[PDB]
């Protein structure tokens, strides 16, 4: 049930980014803002999202823009509360312990940047940027939300996917 609704939301809220005919990253519809990591280069596979103006910021490595009015109902819902526990993700389940997003499997691959990390109730919590290979676990270089702030967490050795 949770996987099905997560996939249904992802299909309607995630768009691939094409550069030289190849996928490089994913742009997600969160709240009222299109979001995409800054380091990922390419064009979003959508005519409407193509001509939008993006406010870039290299400090947070993120490009944001205001979504068109006719797509406002096809966007996910967000949250800023991050209690301890487990969260869903398109490649399995992610573990949040002590402020760290860790991937037990190390299944991350370059080109998967921009995939949202989902909450239990289908809400979005954070957006992945890259992973740091710490033994059998992959610490996530992730960007999250405070009440009104964007904070970028970058564990040592992380590389941009």
């Amino acid at each position: 049930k949770r996987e099905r609704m997560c996939m249904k939301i992802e299909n309607d809220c995630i768009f691939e980014v094409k550069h030289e005919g190849k996928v490089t990253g994913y742009a997600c519809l969160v709240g009222d803002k299109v979001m995409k990591p800054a380091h990922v280069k390419g064009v979003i596979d959508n005519a409407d999202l193509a001509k939008l103006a993006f406010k870039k910021s290299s400090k947070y490595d993120l490009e944001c823009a205001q979504i068109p009015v006719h797509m406002r109902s096809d966007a996910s819902k967000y949250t800023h509360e991050k209690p301890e526990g487990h969260y869903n993700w398109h490649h399995g389940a992610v573990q949040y312990s002590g402020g760290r997003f860790t991937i037990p499997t190390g299944a991350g691959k370059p080109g998967d940047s921009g995939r949202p990390i989902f909450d239990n109730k289908g809400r979005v919590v954070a957006i992945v940027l890259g992973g740091a290979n710490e033994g059998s676990r992959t610490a996530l270089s992730v960007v999250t939300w405070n009440k009104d702030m964007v904070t970028r967490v970058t564990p040592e050795g992380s590389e941009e996917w």
């Binding site: 969160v30 406010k55 910021s57 993120l62 944001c64 009440k147 009104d148 702030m149 964007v150």
Partner: protein, 52 residues
């Protein structure tokens, strides 16, 4: 001519510094679905006058 050129360069540099400071201080609020803090809005004028 030299004095006028120097004055114009200085004033353009100062204006650019003000613009850069405004844009860099105000950018993190455009990456959240949050408010603009009218207290900072009044001192730091922004393109969204009333919307968001």
């Amino acid at each position: 001519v030299g004095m006028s050129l120097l004055a114009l360069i200085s004033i353009f540099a100062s204006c650019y510094m003000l613009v850069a400071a405004r844009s860099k201080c105000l950018t993190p609020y455009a990456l959240t679905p949050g408010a603009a803090v009218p207290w900072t809005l009044g001192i730091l004028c922004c393109a969204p006058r009333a919307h968001a």
